[PDB]
């Protein structure tokens, strides 16, 4: 899962 | 002044005629000048961003808009140098920055040497690790240790804050290793909302395995970053005319990364949308059009998320559609339309997103232009609209991905090169803009925005059909 550019998990 | 006529700017084939790429380029030059006068960036919580806000606000006020500059609290994150990681016990070993390990975005700074303690690991192909997801995983965790945590199931932020609440001095998260493609370093974040107070780095899977099996291991971990609690701003304006209960909203983030001026990302969307808004000042829409320039997108969609979450429920229900324009001037562009129907990547937007995608598709096709889908898995400022059930769509010309041979036949350019080789870089300046890409995508932005400003029926129909 992403939130913008980075993976959050 | 022909494009001051409401007859032209009110209709979907009129607005694109009046929205000229050469005028978008002039606005892009202004953003370039702003970056140049402000140390080369337009990043959140910098004078470059403030001057970008001033420019957008003044432009909208001269066009007759009332402008809302909406502040929100924001923890800025800046890496100030490379990290360090070395074993001190049982044997001295120096690990390599950006090969063995990297920072979690939004980590705190730190310099810690401590025993390394694995937390509820589940190794091997096909594992479903929940390492560090529950406070109970830390049942035997000694305060002051470095927590060695495996990626899996829950957010990095949760893993790191659980470890912090268990008294960890630092956190090393290693990639999950459940498949061969989940063993290297990745772009990962603990989130702008991280409050664990301790440093967090990401390591390769094989390093995690070896460390977890190294008796008496101690690691010396150094994270060189700054976090600063501050604020930044969204810029929001709407037409006086049009139904306030059936709002067509368009958005484009106005901030750049710290590394450069962000002329393609996302000066391109910001400037095209600003040109459109100036033209729409004279339009006679049926539905109200709202324009947003988002702050802190590059920090994790902070501004757009704040905007949606802070809307009173009665006001939120008035937004019928959201259109996102994030990177539409890519040097080696392709013609990408958000895959609202999930036909390419299997993720569907909220009801009505298929209709928006279909509108974009039909417009490119009518013009004899090729197009194809791009992913919508919460990569830009539609994310919180997506979470709230609001139909959305958008346009994209490509970023770090590599153009295929087929796409070079379809769109021109160079196969095997990135759509934007200056993505997130110092070189993402005015010279990094393809004006044909700007022409094509600002045309489509204007057509679909105008279309929906006259009728959201294509969206309404999918909403109605979804309800049964
Ligand atoms: C990393 As982005 C959503 O600003 O292209
Ligand atoms: Na990133
Ligand atoms: Na915050
Ligand atoms: Na040190
Ligand atoms: Na667990
Ligand atoms: Na948190
Ligand atoms: Na060929
Ligand atoms: Zn300087
Ligand atoms: Zn629990
Ligand atoms: Zn962007
Ligand atoms: Zn970006
Ligand atoms: Zn599709």
What Rg of chain A do the Cα atoms give? 5 Å
End-to-end Cα distance of chain B: 48 Å
User: Total number of helical segments of chain B?
Assistant: 14
Strand proportion of chain B:
15-25%
Largest sheet of chain B: 8 strands, mixed
Bound molecules: cacodylate ion, sodium ion, zinc ion
The interface involving the most residues is between:
A-B, 9 and 24 residues
Q: Would you write up a description of this structure?
A:
With 9 residues, chain A is mostly beta strands. Helices cover 0% and strands 44% of the residues of chain A. Chain A has no helices and two strands. Chain A has strands spanning 2-3, 6-7. In chain A, a hairpin with a 2-residue loop joins strand 1 and strand 2 (6-7). The N and C termini of chain A lie close together (6 Å). Chain B has 468 residues and is α/β, with parallel strands linked by helices. Chain B folds into two domains: 2-77 and 229-466, Aminopeptidase, CATH 3.40.630.10; 81-223, Glucose Oxidase, domain 1 (3-Layer(bba) Sandwich), CATH 3.50.30.30. Helix content of chain B is 31%, strand content 23%. In chain B, the strands form two sheets. Chain B has an eight-stranded mixed beta sheet with strand order 1-10-12-11-13-16-14-15, sandwiched between helices. In chain B, strands 3-2-9-5-6-7-8-4 form an eight-stranded mixed beta sheet, with helices on both faces. In chain B, strand 6 (146-150), helix 5 and strand 7 (170-174) form a beta-alpha-beta unit. In chain B, helix 3 (21-37) runs antiparallel to helix 4 and helix 3 packs across helix 7 (263-280). Chain B is elongated, with a radius of gyration of 24 Å. It is classed as hydrolase. Keywords: WT, Truncation bound to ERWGHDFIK, hydrolase. It forms a dimeric assembly.
Short summary:
The complex is a heterodimer of chains A (9) and B (468). With 9 residues, chain A is an all-beta fold.
């Amino acid at each position: 899962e992403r939130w913008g550019h980075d993976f959050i998990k | 002044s022909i494009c001051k006529s409401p007859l032209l700017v009110s209709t979907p084939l009129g607005l694109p005629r009046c929205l000229q790429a050469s005028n978008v380029v002039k606005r892009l030059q202004k953003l370039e000048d702003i970056a140049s006068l402000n140390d080369g960036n337009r990043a959140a919580a910098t004078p470059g961003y403030q001057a970008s806000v001033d420019y957008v606000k003044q432009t909208l006020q001269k066009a007759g808009y009332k402008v809302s500059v909406q502040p929100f609290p924001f923890t800025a994150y800046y890496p100030k140098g490379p990290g360090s990681l070395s074993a001190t016990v049982p044997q001295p070993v120096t690990y390599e920055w950006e090969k063995d390990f990297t920072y979690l975005s939004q980590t705190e700074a730190g310099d810690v040497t401590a025993k390394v303690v694995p937390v509820d690991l589940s190794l091997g192909a096909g594992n479903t690790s929940t390492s560090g997801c529950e406070a109970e995983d830390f049942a035997n965790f000694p305060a002051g240790s470095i927590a060695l945590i495996q990626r899996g199931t829950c957010n990095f932020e949760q893993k790191a804050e659980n470890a912090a609440a268990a008294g960890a001095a630092g956190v090393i998260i290693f990639n999950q290793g459940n498949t061969d493609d989940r063993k290297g370093l990745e772009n990962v974040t603990v989130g702008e909302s991280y409050e664990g107070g301790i440093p967090v780095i990401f390591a390769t899977y094989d390093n995690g395995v070896a460390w977890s099996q190294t008796p008496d291991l101690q690691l010396h971990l150094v994270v060189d970053v700054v976090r600063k609690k501050t604020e930044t701003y969204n810029v929001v304006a709407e037409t006086r005319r049009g139904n306030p209960n059936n709002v067509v909203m368009v958005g484009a983030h106005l901030d750049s990364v710290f590394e450069g001026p962000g002329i393609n990302d996302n000066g391109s969307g910001s400037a095209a949308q600003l040109e459109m808004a100036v033209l729409l000042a004279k339009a006679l829409p049926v539905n109200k059009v709202r324009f947003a320039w988002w702050g802190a997108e590059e920090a994790g969609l902070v501004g757009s998320t704040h905007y949606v979450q802070n809307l009173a429920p009665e006001e939120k229900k008035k937004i019928k559609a959201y259109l996102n324009f994030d990177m539409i001037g890519s040097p080696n562009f392709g013609n990408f339309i958000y895959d609202g129907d999930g036909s390419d990547f299997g993720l569907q937007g909220p009801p009505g997103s298929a209709a928006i995608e279909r509108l974009f598709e039909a417009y490119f096709r009518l013009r004899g232009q090729q197009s194809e889908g791009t992913e919508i898995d919460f990569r830009s400022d539609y994310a919180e609209f997506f979470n709230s059930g609001i139909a959305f769509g958008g346009l994209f010309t490509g970023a770090e991905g590599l153009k295929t041979e087929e796409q070079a036949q379809k769109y021109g350019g160079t196969a095997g090169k990135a759509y934007d080789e200056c993505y997130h870089s110092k070189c993402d300046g005015i010279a990094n803009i393809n004006q044909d890409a700007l022409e094509i995508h600002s045309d489509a932005m204007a057509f679909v925005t105008s279309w929906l400003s006259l009728s959201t029926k294509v969206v309404d129909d999918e909403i109605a059909a979804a309800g049964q």
